[PDB]
Every structure is written in C-alpha cells, then in structure tokens.
Design an enzyme around this catalytic site. Sequence first.
Site, PDB file in Angstrom:
ATOM      1  N   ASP A 170      44.969  31.289  35.813  1.00  0.00           N
ATOM      2  CA  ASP A 170      45.215  30.288  35.607  1.00  0.00           C
ATOM      3  C   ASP A 170      45.274  28.807  35.907  1.00  0.00           C
ATOM      4  O   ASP A 170      44.800  28.080  35.369  1.00  0.00           O
ATOM      5  CB  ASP A 170      46.121  30.076  33.704  1.00  0.00           C
ATOM      6  CG  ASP A 170      45.496  29.650  32.788  1.00  0.00           C
ATOM      7  OD1 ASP A 170      44.267  28.488  32.946  1.00  0.00           O
ATOM      8  OD2 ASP A 170      46.136  29.110  31.941  1.00  0.00           O
TER       9      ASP A 170
ATOM     10  N   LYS B 102      42.161  28.609  39.457  1.00  0.00           N
ATOM     11  CA  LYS B 102      41.218  28.890  40.324  1.00  0.00           C
ATOM     12  C   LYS B 102      39.496  29.290  41.008  1.00  0.00           C
ATOM     13  O   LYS B 102      39.175  29.486  42.106  1.00  0.00           O
ATOM     14  CB  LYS B 102      42.003  30.244  41.803  1.00  0.00           C
ATOM     15  CG  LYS B 102      40.953  31.818  41.473  1.00  0.00           C
ATOM     16  CD  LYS B 102      43.218  32.718  41.615  1.00  0.00           C
ATOM     17  CE  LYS B 102      42.197  34.252  40.909  1.00  0.00           C
ATOM     18  NZ  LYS B 102      43.553  35.277  40.842  1.00  0.00           N
ATOM     19  N   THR B 103      39.500  29.659  39.802  1.00  0.00           N
ATOM     20  CA  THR B 103      38.088  28.833  39.598  1.00  0.00           C
ATOM     21  C   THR B 103      37.440  27.865  39.570  1.00  0.00           C
ATOM     22  O   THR B 103      36.085  27.908  40.150  1.00  0.00           O
ATOM     23  CB  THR B 103      37.650  29.857  38.059  1.00  0.00           C
ATOM     24  OG1 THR B 103      38.459  29.716  37.067  1.00  0.00           O
ATOM     25  CG2 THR B 103      37.050  30.685  37.904  1.00  0.00           C
TER      26      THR B 103
ATOM     27  N   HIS C 223      46.053  43.244  42.093  1.00  0.00           N
ATOM     28  CA  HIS C 223      46.230  43.627  43.650  1.00  0.00           C
ATOM     29  C   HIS C 223      45.591  44.673  43.850  1.00  0.00           C
ATOM     30  O   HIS C 223      44.948  44.865  44.763  1.00  0.00           O
ATOM     31  CB  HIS C 223      47.755  44.227  43.500  1.00  0.00           C
ATOM     32  CG  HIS C 223      48.175  44.703  45.095  1.00  0.00           C
ATOM     33  ND1 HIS C 223      48.412  45.775  44.733  1.00  0.00           N
ATOM     34  CD2 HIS C 223      49.273  43.682  45.047  1.00  0.00           C
ATOM     35  CE1 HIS C 223      49.400  45.407  46.160  1.00  0.00           C
ATOM     36  NE2 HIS C 223      49.809  44.861  46.203  1.00  0.00           N
TER      37      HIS C 223
END
Length: 1203
Positions: free
Chosen positions: A302, A305-306, A344
């Site tokens: 959130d 990184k978009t 991960h």
Amino acid sequence: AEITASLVKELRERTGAGMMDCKKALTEANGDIELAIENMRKSGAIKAAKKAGNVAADGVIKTKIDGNYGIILEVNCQTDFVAKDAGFQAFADKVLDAAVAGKITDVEVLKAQFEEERVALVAKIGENINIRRVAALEGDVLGSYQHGARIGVLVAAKGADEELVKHIAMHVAASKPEFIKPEDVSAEVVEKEYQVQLDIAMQSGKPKEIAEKMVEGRMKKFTGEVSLTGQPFVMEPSKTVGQLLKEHNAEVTGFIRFEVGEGIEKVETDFAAEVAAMSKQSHMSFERTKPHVNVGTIGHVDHGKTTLTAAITTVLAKTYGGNTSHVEYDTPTRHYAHVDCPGHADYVKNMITGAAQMDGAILVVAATDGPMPQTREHILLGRQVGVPYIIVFLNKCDMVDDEELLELVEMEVRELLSQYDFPGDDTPIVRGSALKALEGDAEWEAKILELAGFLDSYIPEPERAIDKPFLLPIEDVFSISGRGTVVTGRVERGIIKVGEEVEIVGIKETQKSTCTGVEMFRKLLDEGRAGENVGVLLRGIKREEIERGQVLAKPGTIKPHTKFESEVYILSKDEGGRHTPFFKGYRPQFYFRTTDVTGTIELPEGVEMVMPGDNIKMVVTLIHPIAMDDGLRFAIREGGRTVGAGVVAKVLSGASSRNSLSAQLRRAANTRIEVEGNLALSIANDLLLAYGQSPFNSEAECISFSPRFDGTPDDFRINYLKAEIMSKYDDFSLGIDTEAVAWEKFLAAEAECALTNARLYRPDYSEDFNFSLGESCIHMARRKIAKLIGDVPSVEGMLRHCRFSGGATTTNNRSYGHPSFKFALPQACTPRALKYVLALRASTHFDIRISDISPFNKAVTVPKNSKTDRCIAIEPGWNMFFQLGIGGILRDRLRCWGIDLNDQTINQRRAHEGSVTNNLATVDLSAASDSISLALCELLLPPGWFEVLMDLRSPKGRLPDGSVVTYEKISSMGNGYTFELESLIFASLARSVCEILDLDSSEVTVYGDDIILPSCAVPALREVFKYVGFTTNTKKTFSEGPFRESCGKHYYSGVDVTPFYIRHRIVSPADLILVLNNLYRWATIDGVWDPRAHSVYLKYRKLLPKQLQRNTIPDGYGDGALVGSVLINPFAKNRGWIRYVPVITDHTRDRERAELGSYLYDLFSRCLSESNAIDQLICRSNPTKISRSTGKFDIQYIACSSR
RNA sequence: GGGUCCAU
RNA sequence: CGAUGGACCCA
Ligand SMILES: [Ca+2]
Ligand SMILES: [Ca+2]
C-alpha cells in the site's frame, strides 16, 4: 514543521503506529504523551473497518493438541509477508490458546474477546486481518499434521498410535478427502449426480440398465475418490486408507482440514495494464549494446510501489530514451526490467524456477508510516534469496512536515537493513513522492530521477555472458577421419580460440586436450563466440572417453561435484508435475545441461513430506559428478516429465524392485498368442453380438457393409464401428485381391491428368458469349494465391525450411533412412534440380556430394485398404532436401489464410460443429495429390513459383512393372511439397467458391485433402472441383447428414463416433494388447465401462499370458500393456517415491552410425535452428544413434503417475 | 531410432 | 526390403 520531533518517536516506538499518525495525534493533544495513546485507540477501528475492502487472502492455520482435545485455527491476513511476521505470530498464536483452554468451537466468541487487539495490529500494520474459521475435534486418540502453516489437518481416530494419525493426518493434508467413509454421502449429492448424469448417455442413446450401470459404477468412483476409505494411501498408494485403517487396531472418528484461504475469491493481480493504466492517465498532464538489468520493487502492499513504479516509467519517457507481467523502462546507458515482489514464497518460485530473478532490489516504504512491522519480512526476502544490492525509495514525503522526522525514518530502515547483513550504513535512500511525479511536479521529478540514476550506479554492470570463462555443454561426440574427436554444443559462456587448451570436465576423471578448431555448417571460424552453435575439434582423445553431459571449459574454470545444497520448487499438480506428494526417499534424475542424472536427497531438519506446489530447500547427492558451480539451474525429472526446477545454493563437500519378475514378462511377451481362425474377425463378430447387432458371415461382408445414416447415436455409433472396424484388415484370406488394383487406379490418375492437362490449356471454348464457373475460380484463385505466396520462393525462407528428414530415397532405404545417412551417402538428384544442389555446395565446405543424377523416382506400394494399396514415389534424395523447403514455406504462408497444417485439431474440432449446426460440410477427394495436373497447377501459381516447383519435382518414374511414366500430375504423394500444395490449391479453390457465393472466405478450412467449408459452397465447390480435374468423393463428403468426419475424428451430432480398426492379423501379445486397449478407449466414458463391450473385452483378455492379463497402464501411455488402474498393477514396482511399471516394447539391437553423416546432420540442424512452467528451456534435442528392429519384444520399465 | 492415431 | 507431413507415447 509543527509541534516536536524527538518525543514523537516515543509515540511511535510505543504502539508502533504510523509516524504522521503520531505527530498528528500530538497535533491534537497539546503534547500529551499518554493521551496520544488513547486518541489513537478509539481512532484505529475507523482504520481497520474501512480496511475490510482489502481481501484477506493469505495467512496461517493453527493447530493445538491436549491429551485428546485438538483445535485447528484459521486466522488469516492478506500477505505472505504478514502471515510469517514476528507480530502476526503473537496474535494468531495467542488466539489459538484462547480456544484451547477455554474450548471455543464457536467462531464469534473469539472474534470478540480479541477485536480490541485485532486493531492493535491493523493500526500498527495495514492489512485487513479477519480471524476466519475455528472449530475443534473431540477424539480418543487424535493427531495433527502441520504443513508450513498453509494447510492444517486434524484427524481423530481410535486404537491408532501417533505414528498413525500423523501419517493419516499427512494423507489428509495431501488428498483433501471431504468425507470419512464411502457411505457418508447425502442422497442429495448422490441423487443430484446420479439423476442428473443419467440422461447424459441416456440421451446418448445408451438404454436404461446401461446408463444406469455406467452412472452407478461411476458414482462408485465419484465416491471412493473423495473418501478417506477408498482413497489410495499416500505413503503406500498400493493400499487404500480404508484397507490400511482396517489392517490396524484403528478407525478414524473424523477429521478437520483447513487451507489458508479457501473459498475466498481473490481476483488476479496484474501489473503492466495496472501500471500502464496509471501511466496513460498522467500522460494527460543503433545501440543494443545496452545491458539488461533485472530489478524488482519490493515493499508494503500500500506504500504504492505501484505508483512509484509508474513514476519511473513516465519520468523516464519524459526525459531519456523512450518475464510474465514485468514492466520495462529505459535509461541513458542501461535497460531495466521491473517486477513487483507481491508474495514471499510467491517469488522464490520465480527466482528458483529461473523465471525472473533480481540483479537489484528496490524497497518502497512510505515515510508517512515508517518502516512496517513486516518490513523485515521484505528485507528478509532479501537476504534469503540472493538479491545483490537493495535500494530504498522513501515515498510520499510531502505528507510530512518536520524534516527531522524523515531523518528518523531512514534512521530505522537503515537499521533493519543491517540486521540482515545488508550494507545498512552505505545504502542509498531517496525521499520523494510518486503521485506528484505523475502529476508533473519537477521538484519531485528529480527524485524519481535521483533514484533512476541510483540504479545506474549502485547495481553494477552485470557480467557480460560472453566475457566469463569458457564453457560449452557437450551434447554429442563424433570420430571423423581426419578431424579425430569433435564435440558439438551451444557455447554457453566465454570464447574458445583455436589452439587454446580446453579441459573436458564432468562425469569421469576430468581430462585435458587442446582446441584443434571450431566450425559451423558453413563458415569455419577460428573461435567460438558464446551464444553460437559450433562444433569444437580436439586432438589426442578417443571418442569413448567423452559423454553427453560433460562440459568443455577453460581449465580450472569448473570442477566436477557430486553433493550440494539447493533450493528447488516442485511443479504443482496443475502445472503438469507430480500429483502425489513424496517423502524422505525421493530418487529422481536431475537434468543439467544435456543429460539426466540419478540422485538421492535429504529434506531439512523437521520436514517429512513434500508436495506438488511446495518449494522446499533440499540437499542433493548424485550418482556421479557434474561440472557445477553456484547459480547453476537444473530441472528435476522423473522418466520423461519435468516435475520440479531448482538451482544450486552452496555446493557441499561430499565424496519392491524385482527382476526374475521382469524376467517372466520378457518371455510371455515373446509368446505367440495362438488360436484357430481369424482372431480379429471373432473379436468383431462377438462385439457386434454384444450390442444386439448381427455379425459378418463371411469376411467378404466385413468390408462390403455400408453403415446406416439414421438412428439414435448409439444405434449408429455401434454401426459405424461395424462398417469400419474390419476395413483395413490385411490378412484377409479369400478374395481375388491384390495391390495391382492399386496400380490400375494410379494409372487412371494420369489418363485423367491428360484429359484435363490438355483441355485446361485451351481456355478458348469457341466464342466469348458464355462463361464458366471453373475458368473463373481459377482466375480469382490465381490472384489470391499470388498475394499469399509471392513472386517466387524467398531464400531467407527456402533456407530456413530446407531440411533432410524421413526414411527412404531413390538411393537410401528404410534401413538407412535417418538423415545422417543422407549426409553420409551420395544422394540422387534430378537434372533440373542440379543448380540448387551446388548452390548448397557453395554454401558450405562440407562435401555436399551428388551421386547418380537422373529425372526418375521409384513408384511403389504402401498398404491402404482391405481392397487396395497406396501408390507412392520415393523421391531422389536431393530433390527432397529442397522439396521440403517449399513444402515448408507453403506451410508457414498457408497460415495467413487461416490454415494451420501443424494441428489436425482445429480441423476436426469443426468436423463436430458441422455435425450439429449442419452448416459446415466436410469434403473428401479421391486420389488427392494424384489429380493435381501441371495444367491446373500452372494457370494457378506464380510463374516463378511454378518453376522452382517444376525444377524440384520428379517428372519421370520407374515402377516395379519395369516400365516408365512421365508424370501428368505435378506431384505424387511421396513428394516433399505435395501436401502443403494440395492444401493451398484446394484451400484457394474453395476460398474463391466462397467469394462468388458471398460467404465469409475465412469459413474455409483445409488440411491436405480434408476440406471444411460452408455447406452452400459444396455444389459450387463441386462443379468447380469437377472442371479443374479433381474428383469429389460423394460417399465421403457430407453436407447434410447428422454426420461429418474430418481429420480422423468422425461425429454424429456432437457425439464422437470415431471407430477403431484391427488392421493386421493379431498374433503377438503386443498385437492383442492393442485391439484390447483401442477397444477400451472406444467404450470407456472416463473409466466406466459400457457393459455390453466390457463383456467381449474380458473374454479376450483371457487369451493373453497370465502375468500380462494383470499388468495394466494409465491411458495416454501407449499399448505396451493393458490400460487399466495402475495402482492394482502388482509388477508395479514402486521405487524412490516414483512409481515404475513395465511396458512391452519392440526389441532392438544397436547399430553402426556414420560419424560424418550425423556430425553433418547435427551441425546442419544447428544451422536450421538459427534461421528459424516456463522453464522447459532446460531441454535440448538428443544425438544420433541407429538401430534395426528385431522380431522380438522387450520389457521396458517406465515412469508413472497415479492417474 | 521404435511406436499409436491420421491426412494425403 | 514401406514416401511426405500432423499430433502425441516410449526411448
Ligand atoms: Ca479426406
Ligand atoms: Ca481419399
């Protein structure tokens, strides 16, 4: 810069809530250190509950066991990274003990005493953590298996030890059994699926008791399958759980099994059209020597990184320049590949499998919240995976006032880096906003640049693949006279210069030699440039001293090794890999460069089972050395199939299964099954009778029986299978029958191609009054063709398409058919084609040598029906080598028109439509390629093609009859392009009949002779096919039946009605196992036998040698043994967590090969390649070895799955 | 190199 | 002493 800075950290490192969520909770508390805490208390649930818009997909599932009370919790968050955190453990671990002591099988009761704390996290973290499902199992003796924290099972039983419920908890964790006993089903699901799937083939015709019996015996499966009892045991798949559970002093009371996030939808998470949809909304206010550096953004779900991944694409097209869902952007000197590490273990699957790793990471945190509690999981996905260097972009800084606050965020995210031995102090951090960069604010745009040019200076230039030492995967060894030893392979790294010393290291005592030379199929270059497909010459070394697998590296470059440490991923069920888990004793082969290699493994400290989908770390030790070093990927294969990938971590130190069983089959196999009469003809007659249909009385009937084309599909399915089953039979006794009928026919073809070659060169009827449908389609046809084809055959094509395969030639024969024998031996050559053959001779230094030169080809006899043979031509070799150029390009091109010749599937898929929609028709032609006159071929093709086409064809032929003919047809079947040509001629011809009838040309699909076009065309396509030579076969062209047939599949209104034939007299037990299996496939409906035929099956099963009646195979595995259930199979030797069954195979004795021929075929093929889940790029094509079939059979043990 | 199906 | 292409199965 408002209140204070120092004593705000105290507000952060007390609850752990967002930074500004702290300076602003002091911006409303006059500076009250302890008030701050409260105001954030009753203000965190507005957060957490407008958080419920984030799906909770990931998480953990917990289990606890007390005397005989157990509980399986299933609290979940929304990220791998949270579900493994320090903190998400605290909560969902303590909540697990609130259900233990106080037994709370009620879900609402715990989702209540904790909702206070369920926000003391979300506030600190930032993901919707909804405690999902709880429930507990009262047992007398119960046990639980804990698989990571992803899948949890709970099995209460009785009289069973721990070493039982463990296992049967592990079976439950690897076989999702929704029921405990075959008799646990509610007459809802059971009268659902038994009175729903009763019409299924009750409509298919199949009468009452049949569909009744099939359906029923099918539900016997639909149950045993989903039920612990009739569920093959997982640690010994021979016995079912219900037959293991009985062999012991035990019985499962019940079981509960939860999987972290079932039922929850979770809608796909793309990236490109996710970022691009951000980038193309703020767009609204010579040099390939550039390295490719793979980078991925990793951070919190959130901190956008978009967005920060959009700012690096916009700001980078606004300035400088301009796998599987990665966004590339360019920089003044380098070239980037951006990922988004969203989970991960969802990532370790990628780096391992080899997909897309990271040459450099970039950590996106937002300075509004500081590092996050699960940040460390991000940074610990760092250490744990390799990523060299990590860059840290601090997003959303405007939303921060006091600057000393920022220099406190760094303070932290430098000191997390350096708990993970990353260079914390010397790591770069940019402070800047992503959304503003898009907006257009350049005071911020310089930060997205301040970052970009950090990727240009902190992640160093990746070592050019042509700059590392020498290495080349040896894939084939040859001993040529005057070259000595040569190996061929795609040089992987570095350069090999002629004369240098290469060292052959791999499987045996590594050896030394020196580079005599290097050559491709044409040039002979004095060096090998990595990325090239060359053969490298060696001196002073015998060819039985090299093997595939070994590599040829600069000396000291790489050493042989046998034991090592790795991380491997295991292809999930749906990715075509294993589907039964395996355990302590997995024993596969590991595919390295060009060769498998067997090896045992040891799971790590505490793991006991492993399964499709898992990606376990494991130590591997091989049966013998390979040349290996850190960062060397390898597949994990079990006899053929690829079931896991994986790479090498550190390279360690390191220094039943019966036989006189296999023995017994070998012999039985070679038995000649014997019986009186025409066996087959009996199987057929008995089969007919099984379906109340009357048998053939003479074999004379067997093939003079015409189907009936009206009846319930079942009444017809059986019937077609009667008219066809014994139609290709050879050993047909009486009958004045011959192959000379075949010639007579072949001998008409001509007379016809005369009649029509003659009056097709006379487009001057008499007048100009009247016009002909034929003469017209040719005119359309001709044009259409020319736009598709060209002036003449390309040479960038004629080159990438001319190959040397098939068996025989006018100068070779089946015996020496394989390509290397064509490159060894002097092949024939037609006169007209001579000019090409030299062209080649001028293209290479190898001895393209033409033996006897002649215009003849051999016309012969391959068998077809019970009443006629086929009439072939063995071309002269060198013609063929080129006929395959234009046969090949005619293919690639016929693709634009919609025709895919590499896929009989699109064309039989439709055969099916046809039979239902009655719009498409299927047309058969008779002597297909035999009636294409040169006439029709000339006025139809470009004149440059029509030459390159005349040049390569055989114009005369010599029959066994001693005599000759001067082909009236342009080409005989046997010819190298005759197929792609008839395809194209037919297709075009029909496409034109399409336009003249105003029908969508694109509805015409053709495959050699099998044309499928809109049914209206069929009278025109028929009047045309008349005029132009061909002869349209009424009895096998359909434009109205309930019936079509195309490319081997037939059809009766949606239903498959494709028969099978018993082509030759059956005498071998192999020859039986066929008919028997073909039968099985033709009357199975997913495992269940139509009973009528199960009758005649069983009866004939008994003709086979004892042991062979019982040796069964899964379907899709051949005919080396009866297709049945592979678990039942007794000679099914299980070994090393991989089943192995024995199949019959035609026996073979090794033979001599031509060292040149193959060496030439291998280099020439390597040249061919150059002018022409996602990890099968670790699989080459294998060497040349020859063998003649013997009369005997041999028992071959092959690999196997559980279905 | 050997199969099964299949278009010629 | 068995042509040319598919498509899969072993090797
Ligand atoms: Ca046909
Ligand atoms: Ca035909």
